[PDB]
Design an enzyme around this catalytic site. Sequence first.
Site, PDB file in Angstrom:
ATOM      1  N   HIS A 186       7.290  -6.202 -20.785  1.00  0.00           N
ATOM      2  CA  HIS A 186       6.834  -6.943 -19.868  1.00  0.00           C
ATOM      3  C   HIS A 186       6.789  -6.344 -18.501  1.00  0.00           C
ATOM      4  CE1 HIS A 186       4.564 -10.560 -19.139  1.00  0.00           C
ATOM      5  NE2 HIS A 186       5.118 -11.395 -20.116  1.00  0.00           N
ATOM      6  N   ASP A 204      -9.338  -4.637 -36.024  1.00  0.00           N
ATOM      7  CA  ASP A 204      -9.617  -4.011 -37.351  1.00  0.00           C
ATOM      8  C   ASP A 204      -9.334  -2.408 -37.145  1.00  0.00           C
ATOM      9  OD1 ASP A 204     -10.733  -2.932 -39.834  1.00  0.00           O
ATOM     10  OD2 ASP A 204     -12.421  -4.655 -39.790  1.00  0.00           O
TER      11      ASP A 204
END
Length: 413
Positions: free
Chosen positions: A157, A354
């Site tokens: 982060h 995908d």
Amino acid sequence: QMEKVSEELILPSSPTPQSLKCYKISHLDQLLLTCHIPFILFYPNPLDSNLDPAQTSQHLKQSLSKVLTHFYPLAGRINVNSSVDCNDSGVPFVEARVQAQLSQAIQNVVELEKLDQYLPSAAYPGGKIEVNEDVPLAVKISFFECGGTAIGVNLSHKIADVLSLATFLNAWTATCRGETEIVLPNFDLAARHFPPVDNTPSPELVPDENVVMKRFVFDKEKIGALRAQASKNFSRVQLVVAYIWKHVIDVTRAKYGAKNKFVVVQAVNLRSRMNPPLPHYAMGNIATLLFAAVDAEWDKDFPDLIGPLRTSLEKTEDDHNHELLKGMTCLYELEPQELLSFTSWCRLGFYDLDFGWGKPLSACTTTFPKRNAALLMDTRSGDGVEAWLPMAEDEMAMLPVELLSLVDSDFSK
């Protein structure tokens, strides 16, 4: 029950030129935690392909390596508060085998903390392994007996918001599909528009003790109910945030006394709110905090909180630095129970990711160990909203039934 097969470090396929210039840390990054964003995809066993774990891992590793040529800072090491060394140390890549079928493993996850095992490393403090705060990126692939898999990602982060996670995963998956047109990251914009300040400390995270997280699911039909109770043009998120806010106010005023105000804070993408906007592919923390509040005596119906929230979303005439000071100004003289927060992973195309053998069955995360620090996510249908809500165990118990019924632990459907 899983066993580790291997750990390797994935390098960019061609070394980073000493020339190339690593990611420069912005002011916004400096203000963020060094904890990681933990992210998990579960894929069923594909219907087209019949690939060996070994083969599936090879496609993944080779494609990571290729794409790190564009995301090279992600193979460096963070030098906290100031910069990233693009030293090509590499991204940890963990492989595991799990002695169970996917469906069996994830159809009744009673403690969401057990999803930890699909992460390659610690995201947050308080487990057995310390967070590696210098590592921008790590990944893990777990293989099920059915052919199903789990990909866990920990992205730092200090160096990325969830939009940056998505920029990365869109690129990685697309490379893995063998496409020539990847959407390239831009690593320069962040520190240009938000230049860093010297000696700025990064905030430390102290975990709270009695916190559990549950996933509360709102499907098309539930949102419809909320929408309809609220009757104006009401979006999915507003309705869900309002509804949860109303109910956490009730618990807060019943356990604790009612004191000063009640605040809700949403963290949203700052790119599209700039004048003019920054592109979605700018990497780094480029986010802002939007506040809504009601005073202590409030107690009305959930549609009454929507005004506050809508007003909250207004882009303002005030500059970033001022917005930030307002933000910090309110947050610090708040007692810990008076704040509710929401980050959103909404509308980031996660359920389209995908790699070459199909779209995800589920996207999850791990327990951010602080009270009332929640996370909104898309549902697989694009209908509905998932709220990943961490609370004090005793506080979660005090929520009303209409809300607690929404807890869903089946990730297999």
